[PDB]
Amino acid sequence: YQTPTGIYYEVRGDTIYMINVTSGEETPIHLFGVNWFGFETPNHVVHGLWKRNWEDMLLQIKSLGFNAIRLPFCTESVKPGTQPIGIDYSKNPDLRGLDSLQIMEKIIKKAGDLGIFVLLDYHRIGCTHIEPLWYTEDFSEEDFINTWIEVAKRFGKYWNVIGADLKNEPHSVTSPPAAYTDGTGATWGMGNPATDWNLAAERIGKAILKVAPHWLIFVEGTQFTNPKTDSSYKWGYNAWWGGNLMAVKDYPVNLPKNKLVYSPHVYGPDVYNQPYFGPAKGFPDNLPDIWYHHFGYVKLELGYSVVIGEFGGKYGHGGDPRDVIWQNKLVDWMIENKFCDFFYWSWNPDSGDTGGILQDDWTTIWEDKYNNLKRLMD
Ligand SMILES: [Zn+2]
Ligand SMILES: [Zn+2]
Ligand SMILES: [Zn+2]
Ligand SMILES: [Zn+2]
Ligand SMILES: [Zn+2]
Ligand SMILES: [Zn+2]
Ligand SMILES: [Zn+2]
Ligand SMILES: [Zn+2]
């Protein structure tokens, strides 16, 4: 167990372990997580620091029973010198004069004092859009990897950083079948290095494990994988961005079994009006089998650690009424099948189709939404 902190994380079966290498103590951990976003935006800092103090926010997250944060970032936020925008330095006087990296470091050190796990998520290459692929004509794979290497060297020193969510939401920007071969979108198992996320995750993960051997590597799904795989299931074309893990069975990512975590995204009627959200398609009793095929079998049949990295919705608040039913159904199903490690989207209220756990006052929570979610925390 090599580690620069004394702590080494690893997967055993479908369970995540935290190992203290000096003393030999080791425990399984849950991830009861939330996303707290903003470092992937042009403000270059988690949102909500106009109305709240950053440390009060971490304390509140903890008081609600969460023990983990997924922290989205974009390339510019993790380069030295990038200035954060929108902080009220009267509520946050200890942030005055800090750059976004210093703020990230301060927040992660504090989460660690509070016993909060951090998962780092390279959410966008620019700070405006999630790209479909892990590069761009102006930012190469080599650049993407070098950024993760400099993130891993800097943040690998914080004991509570559990690892790297390689690239948020690989997806497509045209329909199949062109999306499989037109080079504009992520694929999986096409046998084409320009677009295959399964092969990229191997290359990117290996590079990170060289400098942070103690980290977990979280790999999301794609949107479309390969014609064979997607056409083999009736809703095979209707998986979310980062939400199609159908190609794992035939094309497993070839990263060490004790390091690899699979991390699908899954959403409800508030995010997209999927055909399968018709009561006249089986809703909501049809859901379990759809989740099972899109990603659940990766745990339930193949035995891997599967940590849902995003799910959420308005839960009836200025949104689709079916959302309340959908989050209730999805949480029942995660309980019944022991998907106990997750990250909810999001802590922040300022997410247009999902809202968050906090209300728009950035202070009060959606009680009912939270009470449903809290069933996962036992
Ligand atoms: Zn768990
Ligand atoms: Zn437990
Ligand atoms: Zn900027
Ligand atoms: Zn800029
Ligand atoms: Zn762009
Ligand atoms: Zn089935
Ligand atoms: Zn998302
Ligand atoms: Zn309500």
SS3 153: helix
The residue ranges of every structural domain in the chain are 1-378
Q: Is the CB of residue 174 less than 8 Å from the CB of residue 185?
A: yes
Centroid of ligand 6 to alpha carbon of 290 (angstroms): 7
Strands (E), 146-207: 161-165
DSSP letter for 144, please: H
Please, which residues have CB less than 5 A from ligand 5, an ion?
126, 129
377 token code pair = 């925390």
SS3 289: helix
Q: Is the CB of residue 223 less than 8 Å from the CB of residue 243?
A: yes
Ligand (nearest to CA of 296): 6
Please, which residues have CB less than 5 A from ligand 7, an ion?
310
CA distance linking residue 286 with residue 291, whole number of Å: 9
Give me the helix-helix angle, 197-211 and 141-155, nearest 10°: 40
| C-alpha 194 chain-centroid distance | 23
Q: Is 214 annotated as a binding residue?
A: no
Task: Return all residues near 285 (Cβ < 8 A) that are at least 6 apart.
Answer: none
Q: Is 368 annotated as a binding residue?
A: yes
What residue type is assigned to position 151 of the chain?
Answer: V
Does the annotation count 55 as an active-site position? no
Centroid of ligand 4 to alpha carbon of 76 (angstroms): 7
Q: Is 341 annotated as a binding residue?
A: yes
87 token code pair = 């902080």
CA distance linking residue 228 with residue 186, whole number of Å: 15
Q: Is 127 annotated as a binding residue?
A: no
Centroid of ligand 2 to alpha carbon of 29 (angstroms): 8
What residue type is assigned to position 23 of the chain?
Answer: S
101 token code pair = 């990296």
Ligand (nearest to CA of 368): 8
Centroid of ligand 7 to alpha carbon of 310 (angstroms): 6
CA distance linking residue 206 with residue 276, whole number of Å: 38
59-66, long-range: CB < 8 A, 24+ apart: 59/114, 61/34, 61/36, 61/116, 61/347, 62/114, 62/115, 62/116, 64/357, 64/365, 64/370, 64/374, 65/32, 65/374, 65/377, 66/32, 66/33, 66/34, 66/116, 66/377
CA distance linking residue 30 with residue 282, whole number of Å: 32
Distances, alpha carbon 82 to alpha carbons 50, 136, 137, 165, in Å: 18, 21, 23, 22
Q: At 260, phi and psi to the nearest 5?
A: -90, 130
Centroid of ligand 4 to alpha carbon of 169 (angstroms): 22
Centroid of ligand 2 to alpha carbon of 369 (angstroms): 21
Task: Return all residues near 239 (Cβ < 8 A) that are at least 6 apart.
Answer: 221, 223, 224, 246, 294
DSSP letter for 138, please: S
Q: 136 pairs with which residues across the strands?
A: none
CA distance linking residue 263 with residue 342, whole number of Å: 9
Query: Which technique?
Result: X-ray
Task: Return all residues near 132 (Cβ < 8 A) that are at least 6 apart.
Answer: 170, 171, 172, 173, 184, 185, 186
Centroid of ligand 4 to alpha carbon of 100 (angstroms): 12
Q: Is 289 annotated as a binding residue?
A: yes
CA distance linking residue 299 with residue 281, whole number of Å: 26
Ligand (nearest to CA of 372): 8
Catalytic option among 10, 40, 169, 220? 169
Task: For domain 1-378, give the CATH number.
Answer: 3.20.20.80
Q: Is 340 annotated as a binding residue?
A: yes
Does the annotation count 169 as an active-site position? yes
